[PDB]
């Protein structure tokens, strides 16, 4: 029980700003070897409040964008701990009820292309990513009332390949939900905005391959074609690169994405 007692002490040391930075670092490294880290973080005194403190204390560095590497590394250790809480079966719902993702949206809204901001955004996306991996309808319903779709769309267009991939995966999970599909297809303005962005991404991928990103883009289109109205608009505006052999070569390994692309085409008849 020697290494586990080492964990309890860092957790206690998160409360005080003097020992917190160090405890952030050490705990963020152990989160794949401590399965019950999340409820311990959640259910201990002042811990979640300390992580929120870390988040809010870099708000002044967000606008104007003066965030440094060290600031970004520190807050991302905190975000890494919150991702752990977002993933766990025992803490997910309470995490959600406490509306903690909302204090991350100011990070997702940043547009600075420096590496401290890109890492900040990627790590924030990772928390939302952890949430939707669980496949809870409660998660999707929360995301739909909180307007994370425009945030994700801006990133899907302009982020690093990694950030674009996580952001598209989030959109994918929302779309896969019946309520999410209905929401995005509810008005032509909403559907058009999404289709427009997916269309831009397809163009960019034709110049710079990303298997992972292309896969999620294709899944989004495929899911969109489950909606009769979307199906009609897609017949008209589906990117030509998704019809010809532009991507044949990068796909010949990926049977799954090929199959999906195949059904997408078949659906549009």
């Amino acid at each position: 029980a020697a290494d586990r007692e080492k964990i309890y002490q860092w957790i206690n040391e998160l409360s005080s700003p003097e020992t917190r930075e160090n405890a952030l670092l050490e705990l963020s490294k152990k989160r794949e070897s401590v399965p019950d880290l999340a409820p311990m973080l959640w259910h201990s005194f002042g811990t979640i409040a300390a992580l929120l403190q870390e988040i809010v204390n870099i708000y002044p560095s967000i606008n104007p964008p003066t965030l440094t590497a060290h600031q970004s590394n520190r807050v991302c250790n905190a975000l890494a701990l919150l991702q752990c809480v977002a993933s766990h079966p025992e803490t997910r719902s309470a995490f959600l009820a406490a509306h903690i993702p909302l204090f991350l949206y100011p990070f997702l809204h940043t547009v600075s292309k420096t590496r401290p901001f890109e890492y900040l955004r990627l790590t924030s996306l990772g928390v939302i990513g952890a949430l939707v991996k669980t496949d809870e309808q409660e998660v999707i319903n929360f995301l739909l009332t909180t307007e994370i779709i425009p945030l994700c769309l801006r990133i899907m267009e302009s982020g690093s390949e990694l950030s674009k991939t996580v952001a598209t995966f989030i959109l994918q999970k929302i779309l896969l939900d019946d309520t999410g599909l209905a929401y995005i297809c509810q008005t032509y303005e909403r559907f058009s905005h999404v289709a427009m962005i997916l269309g831009k991404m397809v163009l960019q991928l034709s110049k710079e391959p990303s298997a992972r990103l292309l896969k999620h883009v294709v899944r989004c289109y495929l899911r969109l074609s489950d909606n009769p109205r979307a199906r009609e608009a897609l017949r008209q505006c589906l990117p030509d690169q998704l019809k010809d052999t532009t991507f044949a070569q990068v796909l010949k390994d990926d049977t799954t994405t090929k199959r999906w692309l195949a059904q997408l085409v078949k659906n549009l008849q």
Binding site: E5, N12, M40, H43, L52, Q53
Partner: protein, 237 residues
């Protein structure tokens, strides 16, 4: 690297008059060099920007912060039968998270609105406009907006903070009632679900104490009071 310009007390928020002494006018601004008169329309464009944004920003910030702060405070003080510690901590956290959300919410709308106001003021007073003076105008309105955004925000943040406290009090009325009811039946309030979980599942070293929260564990909440985003922290004067 940059610290905040103002302390909480440096800005009086009871009236829009609190803004005037802190307004800053870069004397090198080309539009100002050419017509030093236009400096006279800055204060009012700023005051009207704040006046149009303060209540939506205050309302939205409190609304975002409220739920998060209620849930966490309820959770942390679940085995605390006293309402005193809970109320203070909730106060500190709510005031802090509200100020933070307020700062995030109003900055870009302030820039836009201050810039818009200054241009229209500029374009009305002098007088008439010109392809090389509208360029000085939009240069001036942009830079002035930038230079006065922190002050305008601080004003609105402080307005939000002052209002936040009593809203949290109202939100936690039932929690205070739980603890008050229990004491009248001659017992300490302890959330049964939390009592059980803490006793059965939480490691001794990090357990919430039925017997009370060690003063050292309260460091988080004291820090919320000490360090509010957008303002200089507090000290021992």
């Amino acid at each position: 690297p940059p610290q905040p310009q103002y302390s909480y007390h440096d800005i009086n928020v009871y009236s829009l008059a609190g803004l005037a002494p802190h307004i800053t006018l870069n004397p090198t601004i080309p539009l100002f060099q050419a017509h030093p008169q236009l400096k006279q329309c800055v204060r009012q464009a700023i005051e009207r920007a704040v006046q149009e944004l303060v209540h939506p920003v205050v309302d939205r910030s409190i609304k975002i912060a409220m739920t998060t702060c209620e849930q966490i405070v309820r959770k942390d003080f679940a085995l605390d039968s006293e309402e005193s510690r809970m109320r203070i901590a909730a106060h500190h956290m709510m005031r802090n998270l509200t100020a933070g959300m307020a700062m995030i919410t109003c900055r870009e709308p302030l820039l836009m609105s201050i810039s818009t106001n200054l241009k229209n003021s500029f374009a009305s007073a002098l007088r008439t406009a010109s392809p090389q003076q509208r360029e000085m105008m939009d240069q001036a309105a942009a830079q002035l907006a930038q230079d006065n955004c922190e002050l305008a925000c601080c004003f609105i943040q402080k307005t939000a903070v002052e209002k936040a406290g009593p809203e949290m009090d109202k939100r936690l009325a039932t929690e205070f009632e739980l603890r008050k009811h229990a004491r009248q039946e001659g017992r300490r309030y302890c959330d049964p679900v939390v009592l059980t979980y803490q006793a059965e599942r939480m490691p001794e070293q990090i357990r919430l104490k039925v017997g009370g929260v060690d003063p050292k564990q309260l460091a988080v909440y004291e820090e919320f009071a000490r360090n509010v985003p957008g303002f200089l922290p507090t000290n021992d004067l």
